[PDB]
Amino acid sequence: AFDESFFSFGGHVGTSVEYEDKVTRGFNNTDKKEKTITNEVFNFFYNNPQWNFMGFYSFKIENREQKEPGYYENEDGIKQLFSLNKGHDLGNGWATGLIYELEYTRSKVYSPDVSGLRKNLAEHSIRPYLTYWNNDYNMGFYSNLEYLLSKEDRNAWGKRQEQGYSALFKPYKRFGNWEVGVEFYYQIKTNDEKQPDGTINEKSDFNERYIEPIVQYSFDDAGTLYTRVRVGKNETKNTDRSGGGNAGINYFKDIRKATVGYEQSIGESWVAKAEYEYANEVEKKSRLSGWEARNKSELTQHTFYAQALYRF
Numbered sequence: 187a188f189d190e191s192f193f194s195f196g197g198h199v200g201t202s203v204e205y206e207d208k209v210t211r212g213f214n215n216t217d218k219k220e221k222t223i224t225n226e227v228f229n230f231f232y233n234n235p236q237w238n239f240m241g242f243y244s245f246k247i248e249n250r251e252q253k254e255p256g257y258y259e260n261e262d263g264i265k266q267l268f269s270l271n272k273g274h275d276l277g278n279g280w281a282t283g284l285i286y287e288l289e290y291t292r293s294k295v296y297s298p299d300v301s302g303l304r305k306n307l308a309e310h311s312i313r314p315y316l317t318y319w320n321n322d323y324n325m326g327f328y329s330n331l332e333y334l335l336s337k338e339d340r341n342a343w344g345k346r347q348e349q350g351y352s353a354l355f356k357p358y359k360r361f362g363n364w365e366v367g368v369e370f371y372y373q374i375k376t377n378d379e380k381q382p383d384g385t386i387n388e389k390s391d392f393n394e395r396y397i398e399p400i401v402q403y404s405f406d407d408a409g410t411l412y413t414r415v416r417v418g419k420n421e422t423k424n425t426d427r428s429g430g431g432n433a434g435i436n437y438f439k440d441i442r443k444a445t446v447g448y449e450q451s452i453g454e455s456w457v458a459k460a461e462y463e464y465a466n467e468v469e470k471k472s473r474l475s476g477w478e479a480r481n482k483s484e485l486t487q488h489t490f491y492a493q494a495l496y497r498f
């Protein structure tokens with residue numbers, strides 16, 4: 187019945203906190219230090235197997251502090267995420283569906299040069315997906331395509347739009363208490379950034395690929411321990427219209443990440459999770475403009491995440 191289907195949902199409500207510590211030693215060979223805290227005051231996962239529909243909502247408060255020689259910048263923001271997933275069971279271990287995700291961020295920036303500069307960001311993700319699970323082999327995969335559109339209005343600092351596509355394929359296998367998988371990812375996008383008077387800051391083409399093995403182990407008397415290691419590369423190729431010395435300049439980045447996390451149920455209703463991620467990204471240019479002290483820009487990032495969920 188339609189009326190009673192409305193009440194056939196489960197899911198969870200939760201909260202989380204994320205702390206990011208970043209240091210970027212740039213082409214100027216000096217350190218830009220950034221610390222970010224993200225307070226997810228509410229998230230809501232909604233699962234209605236009657237509709238084969240899943241939904242997700244999140245409300246986050248974000249605070250970032252940037253420090254470097256002769257400059258600082260603070261940014262405070264609010265981020266809301268709306269996610270809809272309509273799935274369809276195809277039988278024999280196959281399923282498909284469509285995800286539509288909208289994420290909106292509003293923030294203000296404070297520095298010695300601006301006082302409360304406003305930024306509005308809207309990101310849209312549309313992801314058709316295809317999943318398979320073979321019960322006899324205890325093996326399967328997740329796969330999806332994606333269209334991603336990002337539009338940001340930074341008022342006096344102009345507008346930026348990114349648009350592109352990605353593809354992801356993640357085969358995985360379970361055996362005993364183990365699960366092992368490998369995520370393969372490819373993304374392409376265009377970047378367009380302009381000043382308020384139309385002056386082009388950037389017009390460039392981007393692509394990224396990575397491979398990310400994942401290993402997890404589920405303990406009988408408790409939770410699940412997991413680790414992920416990513417090796418990736420990306421490149422940004424500027425057209426001859428980019429500004430600021432970047433006309434025709436290419437950027438090449440090597441990416442390495444390692445994650446360790448643990449999730450465990452607490453009684454029948456609660457679940458807690460903690461995760462640490464290390465990231466190191468090293469970038470070089472095809473040619474230096476002349477102001478740079480070296481042809482190297484290196485990010486080192488440590489991220490800590492903790493989450494508590496109440497299931498119903």
Ligand SMILES: OC[C@H]1O[C@@H]2O[C@H]3[C@H](O)[C@@H](O)[C@@H](O[C@H]4[C@@H](O)[C@H](O)[C@@H](O[C@H]5[C@H](O)[C@@H](O)[C@@H](O[C@H]6[C@H](O)[C@@H](O)[C@@H](O[C@H]7[C@H](O)[C@@H](O)[C@@H](O[C@H]1[C@H](O)[C@@H]2O)O[C@@H]7CO)O[C@@H]6CO)O[C@@H]5CO)O[C@@H]4CO)O[C@@H]3CO
Pocket residue numbers: 200229231240242244267269271287328449459493
């Ligand atoms: O932005 C979309 C989002 O989802 C996509 O995930 C796919 C996934 O590839 C599939 O494997 C499948 O996942 C199903 C189960 O495998 C899975 O266990 C379950 O997830 C539970 C989980 O047990 C629990 O941890 C919790 O999830 C919360 C996470 O702990 C948080 O980290 C946070 O998750 C965010 C991710 O960190 C982001 O990467 C992203 O997730 C993407 C994925 O990359 C992937 O494309 O955004 C997430 C939300 O912001 O929040 C989670 C909820 O609070 O609860 C989960 C739900 O019970 O979920 C699947 C079956 O229900 O299906 C996915 C398609 O939706």
Ligand SMILES: OC[C@H]1O[C@@H]2O[C@H]3[C@H](O)[C@@H](O)[C@@H](O[C@H]4[C@H](O)[C@@H](O)[C@@H](O[C@H]5[C@H](O)[C@@H](O)[C@@H](O[C@H]6[C@H](O)[C@@H](O)[C@@H](O[C@H]7[C@H](O)[C@@H](O)[C@@H](O[C@H]1[C@H](O)[C@H]2O)O[C@@H]7CO)O[C@@H]6CO)O[C@@H]5CO)O[C@@H]4CO)O[C@@H]3CO
Pocket residue numbers: 212213214218254257259343379381387388429430431432477
């Ligand atoms: O306070 C200003 C700024 O100071 C510090 O920036 C350093 C930077 O770390 C160094 O790498 C170097 O910057 C180089 C760039 O690497 C090089 O690409 C080019 O930059 C041009 C941009 O590529 C072009 O887009 C445009 O920049 C825009 C920018 O896209 C807008 O977002 C907006 O930038 C603002 C920043 O968002 C804000 O954080 C702050 O910037 C700090 C920075 O955080 C800090 O690390 O202020 C700016 C507004 O001033 O506006 C700009 C301007 O249109 O233009 C640039 C310039 O051609 O060239 C620069 C300079 O060689 O040096 C800077 C300064 O030391």
Ligand SMILES: CCCCCCCCOCCOCCOCCOCCO
Pocket residue numbers: 272282283284286312314315
């Ligand atoms: C509402 C946004 C629609 C934009 C068009 C997306 C078209 C992408 O489809 C490409 C192929 O996808 C394979 C099957 O996708 C599953 C469709 O079922 C969705 C049920 O609503």
